[PDB]
Amino acid sequence: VECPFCDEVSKYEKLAKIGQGTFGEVFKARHRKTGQKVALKKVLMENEKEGFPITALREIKILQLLKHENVVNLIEICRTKASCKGSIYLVFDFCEHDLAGLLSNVLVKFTLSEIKRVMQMLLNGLYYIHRNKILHRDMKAANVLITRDGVLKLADFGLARAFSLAKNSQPNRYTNRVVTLWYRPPELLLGERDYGPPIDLWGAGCIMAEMWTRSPIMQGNTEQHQLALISQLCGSITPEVWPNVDNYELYEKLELVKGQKRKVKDRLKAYVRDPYALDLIDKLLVLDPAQRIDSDDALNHDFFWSDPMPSDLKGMLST
């Protein structure tokens, strides 16, 4: 059964499990002959209801398209010999660290300059994938990798897809129930299906806050609980602060706390301290997606062009 363009994954030796992905198990492995490290992401063809998952087809398409210094790199796609069935493995370039691990490790200390550099690389990645008409739809600390050389990589595009600026006419009806609840923006929780790049930058704000809090800032347990936490921290969701939010079928059917004033800076002051940092976080966690800052504006924000300028990570990583 000829198959010249799909090597067997046997060429790599699995070393350890490293978490559960959007649709599979992930293993660290090294090439048996060269020692090149890779990450094997196993396509879990459990959902045999529709054959090969469209989610994986999208991921493969997108990662064949996106090539950027801050986007994870797909090397190849491998198979297993029919033993008692076959499986497909996505082979990625390996990254030593993930942001969540670094933030949980107490010996790792970030300088303000290094946080600036992390957020700069992050927003470069988001800028690149957005300008290539791709939504990530799964921004979270655990999906932000950092290599040994301190180069940030956006990862886990299993939930990503292409989007349209279409067309002053029939609006899109994208998949609503996306993004991990803690990093999910308000519009998705209110049932928005014609959303866009702004949802990823909401996650960037949440991630930027974690750079100082070392812990997710809104750890809700339900979609309603999460909405309540968002109202508590960012202020109440009202037409006054979010024009046309009335039009959401569920805006009143869900009942959102109305008294809460905005307390983002008030509550984060003690952790962030830096004024510019607080301002950028404030612009990233805006409720109305139409007013939320975009990658380019974020990258021109004074946070990235005031002293101390961003610096390389290599220093902080060795601890």
Next chain:
Amino acid sequence: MEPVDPRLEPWKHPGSQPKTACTNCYCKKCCFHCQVCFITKALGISYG
């Protein structure tokens, strides 16, 4: 047969089903009804 604006995203492209059902007549009108008719009727290619 009918052009489609390539700038449309894949999920936006219109469906290929012709407005009228394919017949078995081989007249001029019927030989250019759609791609299937043209390939089978006008060019004589069939799989069955």
Next chain:
Amino acid sequence: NNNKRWYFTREQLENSPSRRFGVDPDKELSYRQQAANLLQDMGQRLNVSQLTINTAIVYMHRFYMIQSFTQFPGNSVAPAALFLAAKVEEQPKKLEHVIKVAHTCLHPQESLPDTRSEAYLQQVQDLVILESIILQTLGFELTIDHPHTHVVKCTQLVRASKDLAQTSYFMATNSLHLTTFSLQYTPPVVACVCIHLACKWSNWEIPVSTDGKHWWEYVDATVTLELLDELTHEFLQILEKTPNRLKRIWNWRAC
């Protein structure tokens, strides 16, 4: 030389996987044309985009540069390729629906098998297998560029009439169905060949731009009129074998 992977020379096309098993060139090209026609039919019954059909056809053409028709019949591979393209091109169709349409197309006499019968679940297993084999044979290279994109863009640029745009697009589809240009020349080159042929047929002539350059110069920098006419000759040569019923049905009946 990674571009030239899915683009071949006449020496490479002559030594096809089907040639290895004793299959006449004309017979392989026939199997290809039939697979394309079947893909178009199924696609029109499913009501998928033309983009999906074109992608499925390119999949088929590339699939049979590695595998042989001896081992994989075109009438079995085609529904798998279309089912895959529907996903790739963001218009997925239920596996049940595809197997139903395929049965309707290939067995109009038989009744649509019951969704519970062992034979239906066997058809499902076969389809999903073929999908996995198509994916692995192609190396999961699923992003396909088609001549239609450049044909339409060019007809817009030169301010062509509705009839000339329709004809150019139609010839692009015919190029995918009837020839192996997708394995020989890049989509822009095929787009130029298609527009040129539609012009020669319609007697439309596209003039030079306000800046003095021929229209094909705005589509691909390698398209010379010499090679353009050469590949139009190759197209028409691939068309000479067509049972040219047209020369015969040309002047007879209406509705």
Next chain:
Amino acid sequence: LFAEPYKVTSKEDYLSSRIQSMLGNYDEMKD
């Protein structure tokens, strides 16, 4: 910025002539 295409009254190109004598006058297939 691009003059609309213009017919060629009585085309003589060997390629065009062969295609047309093959197919059958583009003006006819409009029906």
Next chain:
RNA sequence: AUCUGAGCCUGGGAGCU
């Protein structure tokens, strides 16, 4: 008289090695 596939077309099948 029944099966088979194959090649030929022709206002399209119950026509021919």
